[PDB]
């Protein structure tokens, strides 16, 4: 492309252009909150990890 | 051009997008 040229990805490419998946951040902190909530239900250190 | 340009002078013409002052310039036509 020459100079002074831009472009855009939109549609559902606007949605994925924002973010395709911030989901694995939520699987990460989901694993966190599952880990600690089971650390209350177990009420035990690392016994939940099973 | 009656004035400013002189005889037989070489002009930066073809690939003017990347042209910014300082970069070494070679000549294909």
Query: In whole angstroms, what is the distance from residue B5 CA to residue A37 CA?
Result: 80
Quote the CA–CA distance of A12 and A18 in Å, as a whole number.
Answer: 10
- The alpha carbon torsion through A29, A35, A37, A41 (nearest 10 deg) reads 170
Is residue A39 a contact partner of residue A45, using CB atoms and an 8 Å limit?
Answer: yes
Structure tokens at B24: 């070494």
| A3 contact B CB<8A | yes
Resolution for the entry shown, Å: 6.5
Q: Report the alpha-carbon angle A2-A9-B20, nearest 5.
A: 20
| Contacts B18 to A, Cβ<8 Å | 3
Searching chain B, which residue's CA lies closest to the CA of residue A2? B17
């Amino acid at each position: 492309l020459p100079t002074g040229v831009g472009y855009d990805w939109t549609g559902m490419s606007y949605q994925e252009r924002l973010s395709g998946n911030q989901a694995p951040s939520l699987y990460a902190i989901s694993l966190i909150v599952v880990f600690l909530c089971l650390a209350a239900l177990y009420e035990s250190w690392s016994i939940p990890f099973s | 051009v009656t004035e400013g340009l002189k005889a037989g002078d070489r002009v930066v013409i073809s690939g003017l997008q990347k042209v910014r002052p300082g970069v070494q310039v070679k000549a294909q036509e």
